[PDB]
Amino acid sequence: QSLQDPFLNALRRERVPVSIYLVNGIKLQGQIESFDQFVILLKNTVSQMVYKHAISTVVPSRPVSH
Amino acid sequence: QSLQDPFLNALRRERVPVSIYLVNGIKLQGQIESFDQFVILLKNTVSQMVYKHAISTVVPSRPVSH
Amino acid sequence: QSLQDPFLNALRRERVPVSIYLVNGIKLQGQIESFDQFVILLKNTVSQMVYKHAISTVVPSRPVSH
Amino acid sequence: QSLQDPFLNALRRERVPVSIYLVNGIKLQGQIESFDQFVILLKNTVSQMVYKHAISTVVPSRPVSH
Amino acid sequence: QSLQDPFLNALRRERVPVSIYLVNGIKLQGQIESFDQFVILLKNTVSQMVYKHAISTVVPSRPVSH
Amino acid sequence: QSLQDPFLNALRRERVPVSIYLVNGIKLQGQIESFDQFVILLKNTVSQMVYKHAISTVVPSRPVSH
């Protein structure tokens, strides 16, 4: 049903450092702790809850199985 | 069903000071009083009703159980 | 079902002056005359129909019961 | 069910000159010829089809019954 | 059910040159080859697939029957 | 049901280099590896997951059958 779900899940499972680029030009970095329909929880010191509607791209720091 | 709901609820329940970053680059601060499907009520002097569609991230000022 | 509806309704009923901040950085002011699922009618000289998708926050000029 | 529909319909029926402000800061002017769920047709020389998602506000040039 | 569909269809059928203005201020030009629920295919050398969510207005270069 | 799906699928199947223009003015380039309802996976060194809501246009580098 989804390519998004298995991609994000691979990133979460493998604890791959990612860059999440926002539509406003900000780049966030961390590891994906969890996600659901509308948000991604991006972990560093604290977990930032990122609304998907604000994201342009999710870019892994290295290739991942998917 | 949701990771967003228990995260926001933990922030509300624990009265943790948060930063809510808007997609336009404004940073709001306060405590989350309540929220529903589409909005978050952010309390200081008055309660500001923030539309989720305008939010990029919600960042707690300290780690919280979730 | 909603926190948004009773909040906007309190603002409407009590005729509280509000500021409606748009995502593009414009601040509108007036009283909320009415609202529905998608829009808020903001009254001054004429009524401006404001699409919720364009709004970041609704901020009352004084605390209101909700 | 809607306040938006009777408002736009009053503007259409009465052929009131309006300003439609876009979220990007452009102001369009004309008369509303027609509208549906997602768009407003704004008439001058030609009819411009305006997506509601791009609109911040619709402001009549004079008060209208609604 | 729709005013959008017959408008776009008239533009497509009559092969009228159009300007499609994006919310970010870019103006695209061409002829509408096809469209569906979410996108418009705008033809010149190649066909550009334009997401409706990115469009502010569609403006025909001359009046068209609708 | 869709023109978007067969267009993206032709681009994927034929491995045509594309430009994906974001609403914020960034231009991404690569080949479309896969896509679903909400995202496009754009391949170069790694696969970037691009949210459709952030895309304005998808432009093939050469004409493609559709």
Chain F's closest residue to A3, CA to CA, is: F36
Please, which residues bridge with residue A35 across strands? Answer: A40
For residues D12 and D8, what is the distance between their CA atoms, to the nearest angstrom?
6
What method was applied to determine this entry? X-ray
> Closest residue of A to F37, CA-based?
A2
Spatial contact of A24 and B25, defined as CB atoms under 8 Å apart = yes
Q: Which residue do the tokens 């990771």 mark?
A: B3
In angstroms, the separation between the Cα of residue A47 and the nearest Cα of chain B is 7
Taking CA–CA distances from C28, the nearest residue in chain D reads D57
Q: Which domains does chain C have, with CATH numbers?
A: 1-66 (2.30.30.100)
Output DSSP code: residue A52. G
Contact present, D23 and D34 (Cβ < 8 Å): no
Tokens 């009131």 map to which residue? D16
Find chain E residues with C-beta within 8 A of F1's C-beta: 36
- Give the C-alpha distances (Å, rounded to integers) separating F44 from A66, F32, F47: 15, 9, 6
- H or E element that contains A8: helix A4-14
Distant-in-sequence, close-in-space partners of F29: CB < 8 Å, separation ≥ 6: F17, F18, F19, F20, F42, F44
Name all chains with 3 or more CB-CB pairs below 8 Å to chain B. A, C
Kindly state whether D25 is in contact with chain E, defined as any CB-CB distance less than 8 angstroms: no
Single-letter code of the amino acid located at F63: P
Please tell me the distance from the alpha carbon of residue B3 to that of residue F9, in angstroms, as a whole number. 32
3-state secondary structure labels for all residues of B1-66: CCCHHHHHHHHHHHCCEEEEEECCCCEEEEEEEEECCCEEEEECCCEEEEEHHHEEEEEECCCCCC
Tokens of D28: 């369009």
Determine the Cα–Cα distance for residues A62 and D39; give it in Å rounded to an integer.
43
Burial class of residue B26 in the structure, from the number of CB atoms within 10 Å of its CB (0-12 exposed, 13-18 middle, 19+ buried): middle
* Inter-residue contact C17 to C33 (CB < 8 Å): no
Helices of type H across C1-66: 4-14
Residue F4 sits at the vertex; the CA angle it makes with F28 and D54, to the nearest 5 degrees, is: 70
**Resolution of the deposited coordinates, in angstroms?**
1.3
Encode F31-59: b = buried (16+ Cβ within 10 Å), e = exposed.
bbbbbbeebbbbeeebbbbbbbbbbbbbb
Residue type, F34: S
CA–CA gap between residue B36 and residue B23 (Å, rounded): 19
The 10 Å Cβ neighbour count of residue F30 is 19
Structure tokens belonging to residue C17: 């002056």
Question: Which of B22, B46, B50 is nearest residue C62 as measured by Cβ atoms?
Answer: B46
Chain F touched by A40 (CB under 8 Å): no
What three-state secondary structure class fits D46?
coil
Q: Do residues C6 and C66 touch, judged by C-beta distance below 8 A?
A: yes
Identity of residue A48: Q
Among residues C54, F21, E38, C24, which one has the least CA distance to residue A56? F21
Reduced to 3 states (helix: H, G, I; strand: E, B; else coil), residue D54 is helix
Residues 6+ away with beta carbon under 8 Å from D3:
C34, C35, C36, C39, C41, D66
The alpha carbon of residue C16 and the mean position of all alpha carbons in its chain are separated, in whole angstroms, by 10
DSSP state of E7: H
Residues of A in contact with B3 (CB under 8 A): 34-36, 39, 41
**Is A60 in contact with F50 (Cβ distance < 8 A)?**
no
Count of pairs with CB atoms under 8 A, one residue in E, one in F? 55
Query: Given CB atoms, is A31 within the 8 Å cutoff of chain B?
Result: no
Give B 1-20 residues with CB within 8 A of chain A: 1-4, 7-8
Measured at the CA of E22, the angle between CA E20 and CA E26, to 5 degrees, comes to 90
Q: Which residues pair with E32 in a beta bridge?
A: E42
Angle at D36 between CA D35 and CA D41, to 5 degrees: 30
Q: Which of D7, D23, D6 is nearest to D57 (CA)?
A: D23
Q: What is the DSSP letter of A63?
A: -
What angle is formed at CA F10 by the lines to CA F6 and CA F11, rounded to 5 degrees? Answer: 120
Tokens of D29: 């002017």
CA terminus-to-terminus distance, chain F? 14
Strands A55-60 and A47-51: unpaired
Closest by Cα among E12, E5, E10 to E30: E12
d(CA A57, CA F29): 13
CB contact under 8 A, C49 and D25: no
- Judged by DSSP in three states, E54 sits in helix
